[PDB]
Nucleic acid binder design. Structure first.
Length: 264
DNA sequence: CGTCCATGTCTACTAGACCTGGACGG
């Protein structure tokens, strides 16, 4: 549900749909409070890309498709249990809340957005979310400048382990990555964000790791897109011998050693 | 049977609220 997972999900969509053609309507579960998706087309291809903790599907009618349709984009957020699956049409998983149906020649499939807890959301419009910062995986430099122009923001008054969840500046970082990131620089989680960030501009540093650590996870591959590969990679989050505490917002921060000055 | 825990926002009056379910304890 963090940046590398969204990025793996979009490569999953792209590779698995490379040679598929979809058709029909875009079907939503009756229980989902997300919008219905007005799209019909006898023949359309699907593609994706990711930005931080969001992923964008593009629906692309082939030439001559009927209903006339222009290409349509949808932006998804995954929450705690979102994912994308390619399953046979009649063996839908439980909680498949939005579904795209392959059209005939071959075996009838469904691409499903699958979300157990329903924390995920989508939106009509292909637009990214407007306050989100740039992607720590795909827009590093921009990510880095956005953080450094804006240290005056009161976001940086908070402890570093909290500011790292703030998607206005660290679009893509979630609770496992903050544990792992901090742990590699041995920065106490409750050190103050502005201090750890001045001392950078204005041996990789904290912002550099915000890119390279989640990039590591992407390079392990997998995740539905093999889970022991990841549990093996983890050095801190959930690990035996690590301390942990609750931040302001009730989220568990895992670490080693000094909790830091702003601890609760 | 029950309590606690989980890769996130979202919304409204920080502190719940939103949700299912697996692990574990009695």
């Amino acid at each position: 549900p963090e940046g590398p997972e969204l990025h793996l999900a979009s490569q999953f969509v792209n590779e698995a749909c490379r040679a598929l053609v979809f058709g029909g309507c875009v079907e939503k579960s009756s229980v989902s409070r997300n919008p219905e998706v007005p799209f019909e087309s006898s023949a359309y291809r699907i593609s994706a890309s990711a930005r931080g903790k969001e992923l964008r599907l593009i629906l692309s009618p082939l030439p001559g498709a009927q209903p006339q349709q222009e290409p349509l984009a949808l932006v998804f957020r995954f929450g705690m249990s979102g994912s994308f699956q390619l399953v046979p049409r009649e063996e839908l998983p439980r909680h498949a809340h939005l579904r795209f149906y392959t059209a005939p020649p071959g075996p009838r499939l469904a691409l499903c957005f699958v979300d157990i807890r329903r924390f995920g959301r989508w939106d009509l419009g292909g637009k990214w979310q407007p306050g989100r910062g740039p992607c720590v995986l795909q827009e590093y430099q921009q990510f880095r400048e956005n953080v450094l122009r804006n240290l005056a923001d009161k976001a940086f008054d908070r402890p570093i382990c909290e500011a790292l969840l703030d998607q206005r500046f660290f679009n893509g970082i979630g609770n496992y990555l903050r544990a792992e990131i901090l742990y590699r620089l041995k920065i106490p989680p409750f050190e103050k964000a502005r201090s750890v960030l001045e001392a950078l501009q204005q041996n990789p540093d904290l912002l550099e790791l915000c890119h390279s650590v989640p990039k590591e996870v992407v390079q392990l591959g997998g995740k539905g897109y093999d889970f022991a590969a990841f549990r093996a990679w983890l050095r801190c989050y959930g690990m035996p011998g690590m301390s942990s505490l609750q931040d302001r917002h009730g989220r568990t921060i895992w670490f080693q050693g000094d909790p830091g000055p702003l601890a609760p």
